[PDB]
C-alpha cells in the first residue's frame, strides 16, 4: 500500500513524525546503549545492572539510542568484517 | 567511611508533577533511584542532601516529560584499604563476628582474630583467647583495621569487607586498655 | 559511578553526619512517614550514636584547625582525627600505622594540644 | 519573533502528549474533547508554556 | 535519556580493538550439540549470545530474545590479506620505497597535492582523481628519493597474491612472491604525515590493519540456526564457513608448532586465506565459489549486504501498513472540503488509541459500555500497568466503572477525528491530505468536489485509501500541516488549486447572468 | 552522493564501503534515506526544531 512516492510526498509537507509513525511503527525498533567517549555499542549486564564500554573504559558517560532492528543487524555484520561504524551522538 | 560528594545529571521529570516546583521534585526523584545502593567507585549511598543548580528542561519526542540537568550533593560512605574504624561488634559465628562500622558491618574471620589460639563459645555470643582470655562479646568497641574490600554487587549486604585485628598495635577498647597496661612497664 | 560525572568532593566527620541524618528524620517525621530513615540509614545513625563524639560546630572547628596548624594532611585524616578521637600518643601511631608519612614527635603533641582545645 | 508553522506544529504535540499522559490544562475547556483539542485552544488563547530555541 | 545519532564515520578496526571488544576466544570447531546446547569454545558459546530458549547467555545474561548477542574473536596464526583491500594495498605498494616506507615524491609536489587535496576534500570523484594522479606520479617513479634504493616492480596476480618481479645477479627477472608478513612489514613503516596523500587517515584506518591478524567472529543472532522440517538444525553459512577456518586455523598453528616443512605451511597459508576470502566474499573476483552441503554457492557476508532485499535496499518499501482502508469513491457536496465521509463499518474498525484524563472519563466510559458493536464503541482497553483487554460483552459491564486516569481506550472513529487522505499515483505534494472524519452509512469515502483537482481524480470506479494516525504527535502534525485548507494556493504556479470545476462554472454564470431575476421563495430557500 | 549509506542502496556492489572506510569517510546522516532506514526523525520540516520548558507551572 505505501511506498517511495508517498514516502517523498510526507518528506515534502515537513512531517516527520508522520513518517516515524506510518513507517516504523513497533516492534521492530529496539534500545541500544551507546559509548560517548570511542562510538562503540556499551554492553548493560543484567547482573551488576551497569553500563560499561569494554573498549575505552566503563563509565564512559553511556548514552542510550533507539534505533530499528535491522539497522542493529546492519552494523553487526558491519563489525563483521574490519569497517567500524563509530556513532556521534548529538547532543539533544 | 563518610564523605559529602557534588554530581551533575540528568533527571526526568514525569508530567504528574509539574505543578510543583523543580527542586522538590527533581529531588524526591533522586532520593527514589539513588539512596538505598551500593556505588563500586563511591561507597554506600547514604541520602541526597541538596539540589543546587536545575537547568531548563528539553523534551524528547515521544515523551511527554522532560529531562534538565542538575547538580546535586550526596552522603557516601566509602571505605579504603588499610583503614581503621571504630565499631561495636553486633553478631558472631563460628567463623568470626560481624563489627558495626556503620552502613555496612565487618567480618574477621576466625584465623585472624587475634596473635593466640582462639575458640568460639556461641553461648555467651563471643570467643576465649588464651593469653589473657580474650573476650569478643557483642557490643564490643574495637580498633579493627581494615584490610580487604570485595565490591562484587551494587546491594550494600552482598559486598564484603575483610578487616583483620591481628597486626600490632591493634585491640578491643577493653585490650587497647591490655594493651597499654602490657606498655605500662 | 555515581551520576554522569564527579565534580568536587568533601571529607565530614561523624558529627556533622549525625546532623544530616538527624535533620532527614525529622523531615520524616513531618512528612507522615513514622520510618525516620531506611535500613542501612538506620544502622549508621545508630553506630554514630553510639559512637557519638563532639557537636557538629566544635567538630568542624577542631578539623578546620587542624588544616591550619597541619598542612600536608588532607581534611580525611582531619576527619579521623576528630572521629576517634586520639587521647593518648600510642593513639595517634594507630592511627598514623599505614599511612607513607609518620609525624615526629613534637607534632603529635601539638596535635594532642589542639585535642585537649577541644577535649571538653 | 514569529512561530514558524513547524515549530507550532511541534509545540501542539508536546502540549498534547503532556496533557494526555495527565499534566493539568492551564485552561478551562469544555467536557468530552480529546487532548488535541485542548492544547489547540490552549495555543489559540496563547497560554504556552513550551518555548523554542534558535540557533 | 534518549540521544539521536548525530553522525557515523566509518574506518578500519585495530587488532586491539576486535581483542579487547570481543569477550570469547573461540579455539574449538563445535557445533549445537547433539542435545541441541551450547559447546565451551565453540563458534555458538553462552558468551557469543543465546538464541536457543531455555537457557541464560554467558556475558550479559540475557534469555533469547532479550540478549542482543556479544562479539567474539579467532586468533589467526598467520597474517591473511583481506580481499577488499587487496587492491588498495596494491597501489600503496607501488607507491611506497622498499626500504623505507615513505612516498616517493618531491616535497613541492607533497606540499601542491596537499593543498589541492585540502581544496578538494568534499568533491569524492575530484578526491578519487587526485588521488589516482599521485598513484600514477609515484608508480612512475624508479628511486626513492629519500634513500636512492631501487624499487623493484611489484605485480598483483588476483585476488590476493602479489609478485616483486626483481632482477638477479645476471639481470634475468623472476617473480618473487610476497607474503603477507611482508606486506604488514612494509605497511607499518608508513609515516602518519603520508597517509593524507596516499588516500588514508591515521586516526580511524592504518594500513597495517588491512592485512587481517584477529578475525572478529559475529553473534549467535547475527548467524541463528533457522532449523528445518525435519527438527534438524539448520546452520548458518557463516557457521560452517566459521567452523573450516577454526579447523585450518588450528592445523595450521599445529604444524607450524611442529617444525613443518615450508611447503605444508604455505599450503595451509593459502588454504586459510582461501577460506578467509571466500568467507567475506563468495562471490569475489577470481574465487572459487565455496559449495554448500547441497552443492550451492553459500551465502557470506558479502552477499548478506549487497542483496536487493536484504538490510541495503530492501528495508526501504511499501508494505501493509497498519489502521488504513481503500474503497471507491462517490461525490457529494452536503460537507466542508476539509471533511470527508467514512463508511461506519470501517470506522468501527480503525480505532484510534486515547488516553482517558479528567475531561474525558465521561464520554469514554460511555463508549466502553457501547461494547464493539454499537458504533460509538471502544474494541480494546490497556490498563495502566500494560496489559490488553477485549471489551466483549462479558466484561462489557465492567472495566468501565473500574476506568480511571492513567487508562487507555481504543475507541470507535467518531466525527472531528483526523484522517489522511490518499490517492494513487502520488505526484505531487498535493496527494496527501488531512480531513475531518464524518461517519455516514453505506460503503464509500464521501469527498467534496471542489477537493477532485488537486486529487486529480474522477468518480468513475477509482479508489482512494486513508491512514489513521495514532500518537498525538502524528495527529497534531497532520492537523496543523496537513489539513485541506492550508493547500489552497499550489506550491507550482502560486495559484488557486482548489475551486469549482464544472457546475460551481455554469450555475455561477447562470446565477450572475444578466437579466436573470429571482423571485423570494428562491431567494430564501437559496440563502439558507 | 557523500552518504556511504544512501548510495549503498543504490548499487550492485559493496566496495564503496570498502572504499569509504579506507577514507575514512564520515556519513554526516544529513540526507533522507539514511534516516528514514535508521529510524530516527528526518531533519526537514518538525524534525529540526527543539523545544524547552520552564518547570514551575500554574
Ligand atoms: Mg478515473
Ligand atoms: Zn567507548
Ligand atoms: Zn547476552
Ligand atoms: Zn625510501
Redesign the interface.
Known sequence: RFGEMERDVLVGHGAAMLLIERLLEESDKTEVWVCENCGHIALEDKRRRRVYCPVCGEEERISKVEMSYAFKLLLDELKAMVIRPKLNLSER | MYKIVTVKDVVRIPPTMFTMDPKEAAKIILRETYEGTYDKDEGVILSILEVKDIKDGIIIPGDGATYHEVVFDVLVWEPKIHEVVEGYVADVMPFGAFIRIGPIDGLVHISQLMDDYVVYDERNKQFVGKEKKYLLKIGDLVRARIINISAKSKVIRENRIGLTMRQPGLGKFEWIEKEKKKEKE | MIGRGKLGEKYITIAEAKELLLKRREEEVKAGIEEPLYYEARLALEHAERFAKLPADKAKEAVEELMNAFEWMSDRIACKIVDIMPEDSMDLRVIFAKEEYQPTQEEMKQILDILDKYRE | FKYT??????????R???????????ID?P??????????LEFEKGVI?????RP | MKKVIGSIEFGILSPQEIRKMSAVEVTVPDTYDDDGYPIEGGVMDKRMGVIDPGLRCETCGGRAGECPGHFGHIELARPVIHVGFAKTIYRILESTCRECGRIKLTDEEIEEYMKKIELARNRRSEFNEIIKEIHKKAKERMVCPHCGAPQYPIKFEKPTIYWEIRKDEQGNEYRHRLMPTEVRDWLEKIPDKDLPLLGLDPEKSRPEWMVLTVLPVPPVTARPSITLETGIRAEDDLTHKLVDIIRINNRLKQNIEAGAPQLIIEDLWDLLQYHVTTYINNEAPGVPPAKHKSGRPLKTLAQRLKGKEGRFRGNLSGKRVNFSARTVISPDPMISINEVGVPVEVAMELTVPEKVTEFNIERLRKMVLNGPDKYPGANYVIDPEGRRRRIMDSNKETLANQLDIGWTVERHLMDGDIVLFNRQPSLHRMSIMAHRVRVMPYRTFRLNLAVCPPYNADFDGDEMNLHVPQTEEAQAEARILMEVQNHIISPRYGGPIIGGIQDHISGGYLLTREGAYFTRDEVEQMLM | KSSVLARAAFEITVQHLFEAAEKGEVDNLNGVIENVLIGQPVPVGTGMVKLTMKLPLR
Do not use: C, D, N, W
Not at chain 4, 498534547?16 to 492551564?26: E, F, H, R, T, Y
Not at chain 4, 508554556?49 to 530555541?53: Q, S
Open positions: 508553522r513547524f515549530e507550532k506544529a511541534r509545540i501542539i504535540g508536546a498534547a502528549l503532556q496533557i494526555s499522559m495527565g499534566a493539568p490544562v492551564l475547556v467536557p468530552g474533547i480529546t487532548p488535541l483539542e485542548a492544547a489547540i508554556p513550551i518555548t523554542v530555541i
